[PDB]
């Protein structure tokens, strides 16, 4: 268990249950102590978070070119915040808020983390990425970080093999049920969480 001590953690529209800031600091500490490192956030809907936190990140089909398949996370929680919501309304047409998740990997996987200035998910970057990771896409036991779009914010792609080795825990950053679609207000980010949200230094050159 990597969720720390407390009640049963569940995901709701009212917010994550039994997940204070203090419990996060504990779980984060216990994670570092076991050789794990924080690499970013992952915004998604309630049922998904549940599956990830309690079942683990597992590979699945996704709408994109096969060479870019993998788990998608972002260093800046504001970016991942935009995906923390239902992507499709229910029968009546409700679109409820989601949850922000924190992704941790074994430090042993850090040698596989690289970065690039090029925009990802584009054929114009595939070559450079394949150069850095030292093999043809898709990503495997490695990860790539680069602008989600031209001039946009950074994103990180965890090759599924590496993504299935993550340990994900809830974030103390709450989604807003009365403002679904709104942008993350930086003042809603617990100063204590911001302190533990520093990202590792990624390689700009291949191994």
């Amino acid at each position: 268990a990597f969720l720390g001590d407390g009640g049963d953690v569940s995901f709701s529209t009212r917010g994550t249950q039994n997940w204070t800031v203090e419990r996060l600091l504990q779980a984060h500490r216990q994670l570092e102590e076991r050789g794990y490192v924080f690499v970013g956030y992952h915004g998604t809907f309630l049922e998904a978070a549940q599956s990830i936190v309690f079942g683990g990140v597992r590979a699945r089909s996704q709408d994109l070119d096969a060479i870019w398949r993998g788990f998608y996370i972002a260093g800046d929680p504001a970016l991942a915040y935009g995906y923390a919501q239902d992507q499709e309304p229910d029968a009546r047409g409700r679109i409820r808020n989601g949850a922000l998740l924190r992704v941790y990997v074994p430090r042993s996987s850090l040698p596989g983390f690289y970065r690039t200035s090029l925009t990802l998910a584009a054929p114009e970057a595939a070559g450079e990425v394949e150069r850095l990771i030292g093999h043809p896409l898709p990503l495997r036991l490695d990860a790539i970080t680069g602008p989600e779009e031209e001039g946009g914010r950074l994103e990180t792609i965890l090759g599924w093999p590496l993504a299935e080795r993550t340990v994900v825990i809830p974030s103390a950053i709450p989604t807003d049920p009365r403002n679904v679609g709104g942008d993350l207000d930086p003042s809603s980010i617990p100063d204590k969480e911001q302190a533990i949200s520093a990202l590792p230094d990624y390689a700009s050159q291949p191994g």
Binding site: S12, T13, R14, G82, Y83, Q85, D86, Q87, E88, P89, R92, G93, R94, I95, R96, P177, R178, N179, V180, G181, G182, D183, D185
Partner: protein, 823 residues
């Protein structure tokens, strides 16, 4: 007795022998106890679809000589008695009037010791205002003998004072158009007995028995059996002075021939005098059977008194012989029950109880049934005959012969007898009888008037409203009982048309009522019946509305998460007239868009252009809120309509101020930019966009909140009227009018009372008027607070902040910037 549908019909066409009456009694007076004695005696049973008991049918048979005493037209020796159920407390005033309005007679139950209580007294003057003839029964006589052990003269004087206080109320409030309606024991309009032990008698009952032993017509015999009449035992002479020649006291007739025999049995049995009881029982001819010959104490006394003077027979006697039939009563209650001309073709048909004229059926309430979630209309035919399949004009509250508002020309699926808990279909039903109807619950909320005449006005309407102005949050104490509560709420909302159970966005289970008390009883039934599970109920909360005061300071802009879609809009207030029109069905969502626009344009000054660009109403797709399409040449605009509408439904259900429904809010979509590929204009993208833009526009249109306001009608004696104003002047109440009843000293004060000031109102009004006040409030209008909801200190802001915290929201109300596009 078991009756066939043929027998009932044959019994229902003889209206002259029907007794429409209710029982006016305090619950702690054995109201249900005397009622039980009646149903176990005269209760009619039929020789699948069950309903909530609302009325009971009783059968009573009498002799040819008895029928000759009835001072009203009669036909035959059979009598149908409709015992219409009454509320369990005065507080349920609205339905207290409902029962009384469909009745003609009243059995007023009064206590022996305590006499007439404040409640029964208040209900009585209401019944008298409805022109209901009362007959009295002094219950709890058992207590006077066993506990108090009073003498025969003490008990008599006790009855004399009790009857005295009753006629004080009667002669005072009973309208002079009915003649002397006062009750006199000597005239068989007053009975005495104990509901508990199940015995009761009238002066007429003992008069009949001694009538032979004195070779005397019971007329002058029952005349003697009360008041100052004395039968000197030594001289065997009847006298009018309470002393003999030597100045010795004489026992009065009532104490001698009526009370003595009863006092004898009470003493013989309760003292276990085994040798007296047999002798005492024989001369009264009370024969015990097998098991009964061994009984002792109260066990024996109960049997002996039940066989000596059966309770139901004394009551049935007064009911049949002294209570007005539909024919006799409708003659003087018609003008009062008709909201139109007195010489109208229909009003006249009501006075004559004419079964041939246009139908005039009254619907007093809607009764829950086992046939799905449908309700069965309950009422009384005041004119014409109701038939199965017959097409009738269902005229609701707002209905007026002029307009076609609140009118539904539908057909009666089936007409049925309300046999207490069961249903019995019949072909038709002549005027004068109580009946139930099938297939009207979707046209009549609770009350209304059925008519077959295109020129007949509604009958005296009883003001009601489904508007949930108060609500609470239900929550199981044990997380495993969740399914039991979920089904409990689904059950609760079905037992009452005016109860609302829904789920807020947060997922909370909400129960909303029409008033403090109405919501109180519902939370009880839920935690004891529908669910039966320990519940955690939050304090009661008043329901508010969010609205705008002007047009948005500027255009509201908001883009989708994918940054490819944008919605430009602007909010503006909607005229109260219009919002009222929408709430009143005039401006209808399911109405043709062209026909509807003509109305809004001609009758409300709307640009017919905009009125045809209405995309939807809200919330629930019919509220007093509108989305108007004012875009120009937007490609694929229609392919997002379903989403935009959906968003508006949620945005109007819970506003940006503090989660409360919107009211009178017009949203004008000014412009839209969409991605070319429909893969990026799905619900997931548009819904939030529209939702947020609406919030931004709302917050820019000078936000305001509206509070619900009651209209309270209070009946109160002149003396205690001062206590009414005393309470209203600290509840922000505003007096509308103060009318006085012509003859009586009864006043009818009407005033507006903010719902958030009505909590415990009846309790305070009770004390201030000594219990003489008869409250009756219904939702009237919404009132916009002047104060700024965005200001935490202002009266509006105070409410807002308190609510926001209570909901766990950010204490401060969001600025339009939060929902506006983050540029």
């Amino acid at each position: 007795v078991a009756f066939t549908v043929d027998q009932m019909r044959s019994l229902m066409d003889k209206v002259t022998n029907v007794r429409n009456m209710s029982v006016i009694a305090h619950v702690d007076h054995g109201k249900s106890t005397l009622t039980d004695s009646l149903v176990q005696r005269a209760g009619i049973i039929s020789a699948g679809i069950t309903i909530k008991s609302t009325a009971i049918s009783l059968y009573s048979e009498m002799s040819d000589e008895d029928v000759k005493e009835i001072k009203q037209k009669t036909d035959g020796n059979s009598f149908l008695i409709n015992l219409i159920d009454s509320p369990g407390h005065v507080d349920f005033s609205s339905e207290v009037t409902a029962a009384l309005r469909v009745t003609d007679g009243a059995l007023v139950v009064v206590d022996t010791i305590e006499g007439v209580c404040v409640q029964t007294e208040t209900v009585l003057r209401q019944a008298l205002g409805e022109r209901i003839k009362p007959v009295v029964v002094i219950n709890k006589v058992d207590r006077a003998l066993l506990e108090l052990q009073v003498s025969k003269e003490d008990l008599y004087q006790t009855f004399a004072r009790t009857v005295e206080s009753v006629n004080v109320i009667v002669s005072t409030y009973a309208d002079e158009v009915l003649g002397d309606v006062q009750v006199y024991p000597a005239r068989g309009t007053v009975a005495f007995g104990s509901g508990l032990h199940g015995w009761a008698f009238t002066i007429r009952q003992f008069a009949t028995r001694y009538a032979k032993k004195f070779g005397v017509d019971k007329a002058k015999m029952m005349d003697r059996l009360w008041g100052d009449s004395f039968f000197n035992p030594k001289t065997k002479k009847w006298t009018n002075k309470d002393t003999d020649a030597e100045g010795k006291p004489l026992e009065r007739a009532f104490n001698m021939f009526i009370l003595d025999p009863i006092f004898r049995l009470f003493t013989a049995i309760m003292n276990f005098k085994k040798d007296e009881i047999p002798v005492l029982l024989e001369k009264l001819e009370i024969v015990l059977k097998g098991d009964e010959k061994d009984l002792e104490g109260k066990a024996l006394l109960k049997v002996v008194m039940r066989k000596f003077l059966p309770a139901a027979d004394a009551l049935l006697e007064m009911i049949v012989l002294h209570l007005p039939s539909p024919v006799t009563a409708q003659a003087y209650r018609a003008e009062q029950l008709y909201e139109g001309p007195a010489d109208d073709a229909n009003c006249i048909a009501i006075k004559n109880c004419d079964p041939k004229a246009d139908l005039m059926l009254y619907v007093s309430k809607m009764v829950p049934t086992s046939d799905k979630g449908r309700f069965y209309a309950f009422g009384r035919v005041f004119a014409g005959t109701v038939k199965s399949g017959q097409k009738v004009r269902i005229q609701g509250p707002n209905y007026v012969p002029g307009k076609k508002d609140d009118l539904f020309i539908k057909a009666i699926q089936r007409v049925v007898l309300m046999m207490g808990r069961f249903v019995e279909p019949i072909d038709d039903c002549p005027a004068g009888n109580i009946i139930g109807l099938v297939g009207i619950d979707q046209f009549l909320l609770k009350t209304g008037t059925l008519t077959t005449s295109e020129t007949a006005h509604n009958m005296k309407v009883m003001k009601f409203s489904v508007s949930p102005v108060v609500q609470v949050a239900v929550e199981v104490k044990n997380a495993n009982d969740l399914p039991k509560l979920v089904e409990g709420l689904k059950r609760l909302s079905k037992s009452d048309p005016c109860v609302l159970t829904y789920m807020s966005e947060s997922g909370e289970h909400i129960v909303a009522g029409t008033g403090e008390l109405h919501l109180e009883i519902c939370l009880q039934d839920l935690e004891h019946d529908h669910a039966g599970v320990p519940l955690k109920i939050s304090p009661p909360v008043v329901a508010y509305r969010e609205t705008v005061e002007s047009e948005s300071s500027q255009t509201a802009l908001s883009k989708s998460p994918n940054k490819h879609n944008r919605i430009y809009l602007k909010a503006e207030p909607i005229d109260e007239e219009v919002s009222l029109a929408i709430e009143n069905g005039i401006i209808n969502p399911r109405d043709d868009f062209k026909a509807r626009a003509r109305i809004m344009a001609d009758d409300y000054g709307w640009d017919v252009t905009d009125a045809r660009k209405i995309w939807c109403f809200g919330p629930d797709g019919n509220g007093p809120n509108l989305v108007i399409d004012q875009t120009k040449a937007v490609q694929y605009l229609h392919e997002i309509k379903d989403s935009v509408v959906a968003a508006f439904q949620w945005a109007t259900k819970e506003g940006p101020i503090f989660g409360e429904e919107m009211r009178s809010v017009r949203v004008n979509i000014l412009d839209v930019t969409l991605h070319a590929d429909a893969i990026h204009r799905g619900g997931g993208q548009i819904i939030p966009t529209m939702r947020r833009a609406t919030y931004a526009g709302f917050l820019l249109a000078d936000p305001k909140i509206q509070e619900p306001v009651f209209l309270v009608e209070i009946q109160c004696p002149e003396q205690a009227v001062g206590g009414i104003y005393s309470v209203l002047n600290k509840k922000r109440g505003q007096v509308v009018s103060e009318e006085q009843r012509p003859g009586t000293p009864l006043f009818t004060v009407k005033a507006y009372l903010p719902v958030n000031e009505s909590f415990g109102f009846t309790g305070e009004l009770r004390q201030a008027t000594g219990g003489q006040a008869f409250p009756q409030m219904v939702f009237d209008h919404w009132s916009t607070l002047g104060s700024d909801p965005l200001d935490p200190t202002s009266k509006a802001g105070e409410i807002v902040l308190a609510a926001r915290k209570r909901h766990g929201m950010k204490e401060e109300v969001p600025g339009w910037q939060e929902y506006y596009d983050k540029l």
